[PDB]
């Protein structure tokens, strides 16, 4: 980026910049990800595959399109992207599990396998042991575990009103 | 309003004497009043300066006057009465807002008499609106704080 002119640019530049964007996404530094992404020229962000795949992957992650995020594992425009993508998949497994925790008053197992994108009941059982589930007594993971006036804070606010009125 | 006195001697005031000795500059009481001067001050009697004794102990009880018990300190106003008062006061605020819009309009328009002879005998929307906001805001803030303190302490 520094030595514009006096240099002819390297064809590997866009690929390696996209790899850096993948690294930033994997480490979950979204602000720095977007900041560096802004460095890429417009048409480079919009057309070049190496810069489109990282940005599209962030778009899918923000939307929740975990299916397409997983399909990125097959997309992989450059094979070197696998390393920074595997850790992102594991973090996304955690994020999907959090979504499942909050939603899904009740969920089964045979379909929860596809939902979590796992391929083995042993992996399913290990992951359930991770964090902790009810194992599906009726084959259903029933993780349905869902006053107190802030009187102190409200009194502080009202006293602030009084003080701001009386310092006249 | 209180004053101490002693009488001047007719004998001395006819035989040319001042029946008071001016060793100090403490003869500046209040520039004695015209009432006293015409009723016989400095001729037949003189005024003696008056002071008071402060003990800081009687003053404690004199301060205890006007004091309110903690019952009154922590009591909440009848909520129905409070709501009715807020409703009414906001109604007068609405009317005074109409009148304030009217007055601000015809205020800069002309100021020959706006200085002093444009509010005498007529309501002042700005002044009454200020009074209403002051009173209602005091009441509401105080009752909110009382309610919150009560909700916690009486738990």
UniProtKB/Swiss-Prot annotation, chain A:
GO cellular component, one term: nucleus
UniProt function note: Component of the 26S proteasome, a multiprotein complex involved in the ATP-dependent degradation of ubiquitinated proteins. This complex plays a key role in the maintenance of protein homeostasis by removing misfolded or damaged proteins, which could impair cellular functions, and by removing proteins whose functions are no longer required. Therefore, the proteasome participates in numerous cellular processes, including cell cycle progression, apoptosis, or DNA damage repair.
Residue ranges of domain PCI in the record: 1-150
Organism annotation: Homo sapiens (Human)
Chain residue numbers at which the record places covalent cross-link Glycyl lysine isopeptide (Lys-Gly) (interchain with G-Cter in SUMO2): 122
Family: Belongs to the proteasome subunit S14 family.
Protein name, as recorded: 26S proteasome non-ATPase regulatory subunit 8
GO biological process: proteasome-mediated ubiquitin-dependent protein catabolic process
Keywords carried by this UniProt record: Isopeptide bond, Phosphoprotein, Proteasome, Ubl conjugation
Subunit details: Component of the 19S proteasome regulatory particle complex. The 26S proteasome consists of a 20S core particle (CP) and two 19S regulatory subunits (RP). The regulatory particle is made of a lid composed of 9 subunits including PSMD8, a base containing 6 ATPases and few additional components. Interacts with DDI2. Interacts with TASOR.
Segment of the intact protein contained: 176 to 349 of 350
UniProtKB/Swiss-Prot annotation, chain B:
Any GO CC annotation of this UniProt entry: cytosolic proteasome complex
Entry EC no(s): 3.4.19.-
GO terms of molecular function: endopeptidase activator activity; K63-linked deubiquitinase activity; metal ion binding; metal-dependent deubiquitinase activity; metallopeptidase activity; proteasome binding
Domain of life: Eukaryota
GO biological process per UniProt: double-strand break repair via homologous recombination; double-strand break repair via nonhomologous end joining; proteasome-mediated ubiquitin-dependent protein catabolic process; protein deubiquitination; protein K63-linked deubiquitination; regulation of proteasomal protein catabolic process; response to ethanol; ubiquitin-dependent protein catabolic process
Residue numbers carrying Phosphoserine: 69
Residues where Phosphothreonine is found: 111
Known tissue expression: Widely expressed. Highest levels in heart and skeletal muscle.
Protein family according to the UniProt entry: Belongs to the peptidase M67A family. PSMD14 subfamily.
Described function: Component of the 26S proteasome, a multiprotein complex involved in the ATP-dependent degradation of ubiquitinated proteins. This complex plays a key role in the maintenance of protein homeostasis by removing misfolded or damaged proteins, which could impair cellular functions, and by removing proteins whose functions are no longer required. Therefore, the proteasome participates in numerous cellular processes, including cell cycle progression, apoptosis, or DNA damage repair.
Name the UniProt record assigns to this protein: 26S proteasome non-ATPase regulatory subunit 14
Parent-protein residues present: 156 to 310 of 310
């Amino acid at each position: 980026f520094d030595y514009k002119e006096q240099l002819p640019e390297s064809a590997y530049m866009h690929q390696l910049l996209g790899l850096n964007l993948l690294f930033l996404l994997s480490q979950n530094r979204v602000a720095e990800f977007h900041t560096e992404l802004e460095r890429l020229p417009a048409k480079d962000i919009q057309t070049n595959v190496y810069i489109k795949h990282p940005v599209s992957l962030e778009q899918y992650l923000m939307e929740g399109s975990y299916n397409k995020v997983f399909l990125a594992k097959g997309n992989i425009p450059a094979e070197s992207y696998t390393f920074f993508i595997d850790i992102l998949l594991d973090t996304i497994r955690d994020e999907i599990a959090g979504c499942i925790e909050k939603a899904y008053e009740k969920i089964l197992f045979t379909e929860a396998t596809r939902i979590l994108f796992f391929n083995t009941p042993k992996k399913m059982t290990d992951y359930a042991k991770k964090r902790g589930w009810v194992l599906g007594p009726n084959n259903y993971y029933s993780f349905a575990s869902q006053t107190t006036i802030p009187s102190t804070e409200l009194a502080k606010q009202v006293i602030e009103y009084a003080r701001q009125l009386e310092m006249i | 309003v209180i004053d101490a006195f002693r009488l001047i001697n007719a004998n001395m005031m006819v035989l040319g004497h001042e029946p008071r000795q001016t060793t100090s500059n403490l003869g500046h009481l209040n520039k004695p009043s015209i009432q006293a001067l015409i009723h016989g001050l400095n001729r037949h009697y003189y005024s003696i300066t008056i002071n008071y004794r402060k003990n800081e102990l009687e003053q404690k009880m004199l301060l205890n006057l006007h004091k309110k018990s903690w019952m009154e300190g922590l009591t909440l106003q009848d909520y129905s009465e409070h709501c009715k008062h807020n409703e009414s006061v906001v109604k007068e605020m609405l009317e005074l807002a109409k009148n304030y819009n009217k007055a601000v309009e015809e205020e800069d328009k002309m100021t020959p008499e706006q200085l002093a002879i444009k509010n005498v005998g007529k309501q002042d929307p700005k002044r009454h609106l200020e009074e209403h906001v002051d009173v209602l805001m005091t009441s509401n803030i105080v009752q909110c704080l009382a309610a919150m303190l009560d909700t916690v302490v009486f738990k």
